[PDB]
Every structure is written in C-alpha cells, then in structure tokens.
C-alpha cells in the first residue's frame, strides 16, 4: 500500500479509554502501526490492551521491549514504564525503559512523541486526545517541527480539554478535529501525497 513505512502515535489521559476505542475500531488489518501512551496504572494497561483486542480488527497488545512495530497492530505502553519508538537497522521497534517520570507521568506522552519525532520524522502522524495536564505538548511540537502531521482532539468532544489545549497553545498542532473525525483524518493524511504505491 504505502511506498514508505508509516505509523501513528497517540497520547491520552482522562476519558482516553473510550476515545482510543472509538479511533481504533474502524481500522482493518492493512492499517499502519499504532503506538499509544495512555495514562493509567501498571496492570490496567494489560487489561485495556485485552479489552480493545476483543473489539478491534487489528491486534492490540501491551508493548514489549524489542518487538518489531508491525502494521495491523496497536501497542499500549506498559504502566509505570516509558515507551519509545526505536530503530534497529531496517525495523522499527519498541523500547521500554525505567527512566524518571516526565511531567509526573510514566509512561509519558512526551517521551513517546519525542522518540517518534527523532525516528519517524515526517513518516508519522501524532494524535493527542482528551486528558488532564501538559504531558505530550512539547513532544507534539517536536513532531510538528520534524514535519509530521499533528492532530488534537477538539473541545466539544473532549472529557477533559487539558492535554489537547496545551498542545495547541504550544504551537505544535496542524489541525484540531472532533473525535468522530480523527481516524479518518490521521489515515487520510498518513497516506496523502505520494505515499500510496501506484
């Protein structure tokens, strides 16, 4: 499908479990990989991955250090550990680490986003959903400056308009969209230009 390997990175907090479920449902097996950092306790992240796996078409799992980031899969950061995107040669991979909390969170959305900006550059779409605080804002600005398309959930549809608000205020958001249009927008933009093989 795409001439280059692309991926989507999502960050969320309060209200995020229902928001993430809404965004992932429409994706078929041919979809690009999705890497997500959801604020929640350890253990809960394993349960959330399983819950989503039962409802979605794509495979959803709690991320493991060193596994390859595959298309048609969604990776959830493990609670109390940071998740980053990394690259071993030709393959994108998950990197799990126990570094200090960032913005009082571990996993941290900023930690995820900064790593996607470094390794995927413009070959990624960053999405920030409903949540409290500023975790993710600086990371999204890094993605935006690296050329990635960035999307923030709008005020009307958010449970808590903190995370997206902060992201917008930092100047790192390409567009603000309603929750019902996020999957459509991230997928259209990730495949635009010359992305599709013809």
UniProtKB/Swiss-Prot annotation:
For the biological process aspect of GO, one term held by this record is:
chemotaxis
Source organism, top-level taxon: Bacteria
Statement: the UniProt record of this protein carries the keyword Magnesium: no
Query: How would you classify this enzyme at the top EC level?
Result: hydrolase
Regulation of its function: Phosphorylation of the N-terminal regulatory domain activates the methylesterase activity.
What GO terms fall under cellular component here?
A: cytoplasm
State its Enzyme Commission number(s).
Answer: 3.1.1.61, 3.5.1.44
Q: Which reaction does it catalyse?
A: [protein]-L-glutamate 5-O-methyl ester + H2O = L-glutamyl-[protein] + methanol + H(+); L-glutaminyl-[protein] + H2O = L-glutamyl-[protein] + NH4(+)
**Gene Ontology molecular function terms on file:** phosphorelay response regulator activity; protein-glutamate methylesterase activity; protein-glutamine glutaminase activity
- Subcellular compartments: Cytoplasm
How does a null allele present?
Cells lacking this gene display a strong clockwise motor bias; in combination with a yhjH disruption cells switch to a counterclockwise bias.
UniProt keyword terms in alphabetical order = Chemotaxis, Cytoplasm, Hydrolase, Phosphoprotein
For the CheB-type methylesterase domain, which residue ranges apply? 1-193
The catalytic site is made up of: 13, 39, 135
Protein role: Involved in chemotaxis. Part of a chemotaxis signal transduction system that modulates chemotaxis in response to various stimuli. Catalyzes the demethylation of specific methylglutamate residues introduced into the chemoreceptors (methyl-accepting chemotaxis proteins or MCP) by CheR. Also mediates the irreversible deamidation of specific glutamine residues to glutamic acid.
In the UniProt entry, what is the domain comment?
Contains a C-terminal catalytic domain, and an N-terminal region which modulates catalytic activity. The N-terminal domain is not essential for catalysis.
What family does this belong to? Belongs to the CheB family.
Q: What is this protein called?
A: Protein-glutamate methylesterase/protein-glutamine glutaminase
- The gene name on file is cheB
Q: Which residues of the full protein are shown?
A: 152 to 349 of 349
